[PDB]
Amino acid sequence: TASLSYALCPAGSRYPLFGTIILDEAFSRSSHAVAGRIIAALREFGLHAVFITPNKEMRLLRDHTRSAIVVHRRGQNSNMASLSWEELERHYQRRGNA
Amino acid sequence: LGAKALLDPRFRLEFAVSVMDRQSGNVIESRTGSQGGSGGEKEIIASYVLTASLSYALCPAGSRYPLFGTIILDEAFSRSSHAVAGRIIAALREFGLHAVFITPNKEMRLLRDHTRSAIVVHRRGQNSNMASLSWEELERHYQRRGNA
Amino acid sequence: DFWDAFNGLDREVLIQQTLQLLAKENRPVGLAELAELLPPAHDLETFAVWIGMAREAGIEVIDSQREFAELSDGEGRRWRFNLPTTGLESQALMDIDWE
Amino acid sequence: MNQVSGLAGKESFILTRIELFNWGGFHGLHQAAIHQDGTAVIGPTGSGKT
Amino acid sequence: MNQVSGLAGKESFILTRIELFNWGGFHGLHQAAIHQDGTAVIGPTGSGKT
Numbered sequence: 466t467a468s469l470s471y472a473l474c475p476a477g478s479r480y481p482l483f484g485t486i487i488l489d490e491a492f493s494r495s496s497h498a499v500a501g502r503i504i505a506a507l508r509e510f511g512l513h514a515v516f517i518t519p520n521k522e523m524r525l526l527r528d529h530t531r532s533a534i535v536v537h538r539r540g541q542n543s544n545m546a547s548l549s550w551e552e553l554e555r556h557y558q559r560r561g562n563a
Numbered sequence: 564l565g566a567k568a569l570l571d572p573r574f575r576l577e578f579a580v581s582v583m584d585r586q587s588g589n590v591i592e593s594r595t596g597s598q599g600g601s602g603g604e605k606e607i608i609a610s611y612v613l614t615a616s617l618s619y620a621l622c623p624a625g626s627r628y629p630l631f632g633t634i635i636l637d638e639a640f641s642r643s644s645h646a647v648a649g650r651i652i653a654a655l656r657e658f659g660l661h662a663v664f665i666t667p668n669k670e671m672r673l674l675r676d677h678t679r680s681a682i683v684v685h686r687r688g689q690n691s692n693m694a695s696l697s698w699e700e701l702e703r704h705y706q707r708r709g710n711a
Numbered sequence: 712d713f714w715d716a717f718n719g720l721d722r723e724v725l726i727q728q729t730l731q732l733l734a735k736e737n738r739p740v741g742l743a744e745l746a747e748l749l750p751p752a753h754d755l756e757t758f759a760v761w762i763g764m765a766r767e768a769g770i771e772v773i774d775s776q777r778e779f780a781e782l783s784d785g786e787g788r789r790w791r792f793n794l795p796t797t798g799l800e801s802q803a804l805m806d807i808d809w810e
Numbered sequence: 811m812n813q814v815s816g817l818a819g820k821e822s823f824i825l826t827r828i829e830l831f832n833w834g835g836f837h838g839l840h841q842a843a844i845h846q847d848g849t850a851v852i853g854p855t856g857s858g859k860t
Numbered sequence: 861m862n863q864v865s866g867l868a869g870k871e872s873f874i875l876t877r878i879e880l881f882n883w884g885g886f887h888g889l890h891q892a893a894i895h896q897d898g899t900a901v902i903g904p905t906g907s908g909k910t
């Protein structure tokens with residue numbers, strides 16, 4: 466992350482011109498104590514982060530991101546729906562009536 | 564390998580996994596390895612074919628139960644959803660292997676439903692220690708005079 | 712299963728609640744007592760958090776000594792938890808900084 | 811958190827949208843909105859995140 | 861699924877206890893019982909389970 470943050474900074478500038486970094490399988494090998502530090506370092510260097518995770522560490526993502534992209538499978542076709550955490554909370558509350 | 568494929572029985576046949584359809588009995592996928600796949604979909608291939616082959620090695624010919632029945636899984640379900648790890652546990656159950664799962668505080672509610680004890684390991688400074696925890700079910704009655 | 716994972720234990724909150732309880736009582740409290748006064752909904756993981764706090768604060772846990780607790784689920788199922796014997800003390804846990 | 815979020819959208823280009831068409835398992839047209847404050851991507855195994 | 865462990869410990873040998881001494885970061889004597897019906901090892905990163 467530090468290397469990329471430097472690399473994307475134009476010469477003579479402190480902030481990267483390209484800000485997005487993708488972390489696929491974000492935290493498959495770390496607990497909260499280390500994932501939180503990963504997030505802190507990732508934001509400190511100035512990057513805007515997009516995380517991927519197969520429904521793991523959901524409670525941690527909820528505190529450091531503001532929208533989720535729920536991707537689900539049906540047969541051979543895949544569909545994706547973008548939502549805010551709070552809308553998904555309302556959805557879970559509707560589920561809570563079951 | 565040229566002489567192996569002549570004198571060695573193991574090299575006289577090539578292996579490949581195949582996913583069968585429960586209803587029709589046809590083949591959906593022929594898979595000589597684990598290339599492609601998503602991960603979790605790859606890990607389930609790995610765990611299934613390893614567990615099946617692990618009961619092959621640990622069982623005398625014709626015996627239903629291996630004489631050594633324990634298996635250790637490090638980074639258990641590190642890259643698999645709950646619905647997939649459930650089927651890995653089911654497979655480990657079918658072959659009859661007592662399972663010891665490792666995990667860095669992930670999928671805790673999954674282990675909760677398929678294990679009856681945990682070994683909490685912690686580190687401070689240059690030292691580490693361990694503590695034993697366990698639980699069972701009071702199946703005698705959930706709630707007498709009530710639905711169950 | 713997606714929703715069950717979505718309703719994960721909030722690790723930070725449990726620390727604050729345990730600290731509040733230890734401030735209120737100001738005495739050695741066992742894991743069974745914490746279970747009864749702070750009944751968890753994610754029992755296994757919450758106990759892991761408590762034992763982690765104990766080990767982090769240097770409050771060693773007598774594994775050889777056993778104490779018991781009783782809990783239940785959202786579907787009537789009732790479990791009996793076998794636990795190690797140890798006692799939290801607010802001073803040590805508040806001296807430590809929590810991550 | 812937002813005290814640090816002021817960097818995003820102000821200094822650097824932030825990925826705010828991806829659109830697909832018959833890409834992988836995504837038949838037809840699809841699109842995901844990326845919040846400028848950080849986005850997570852979730853879904854069961856083998857659902858198309860990668 | 862869980863009750864299937866009844867066969868384990870009767871038809872086969874299953875691990876039930878591990879003892880350590882001056883191994884890795886585990887100074888001195890250490891122990892951990894392993895339950896008949898399966899068990900888990902949990903602890904934060906760099907804890908010693910592996």
Ligand SMILES: Nc1ncnc2c1ncn2[C@@H]1O[C@H](COP(=O)(O)OP(=O)(O)O)[C@@H](O)[C@H]1O
Nearest residue numbers: 599600601602834835854855856857858859860
């Ligand atoms: N080009 C491909 N090669 C092999 N498998 C593919 C390919 N494209 C799609 N698949 C299938 O579609 C999914 C692609 O992987 P994906 O689901 O995105 O991984 P992840 O679980 O991390 O989201 C998988 O279910 C896979 O089986």
Ligand SMILES: Nc1ncnc2c1ncn2[C@@H]1O[C@H](COP(=O)(O)OP(=O)(O)O)[C@@H](O)[C@H]1O
Nearest residue numbers: 667684686884885903904905906907908909910
């Ligand atoms: N041979 C080694 N080389 C470097 N570090 C080691 C070595 N052995 C042990 N360590 C330390 O002891 C621990 C070994 O890894 P461990 O914590 O058991 O993995 P896990 O995160 O799965 O519990 C780590 O804290 C590590 O720092």
Ligand code: BEF
Nearest residue numbers: 490601602859860
């Ligand atoms: F490996 Be994929 F991101 F589930």
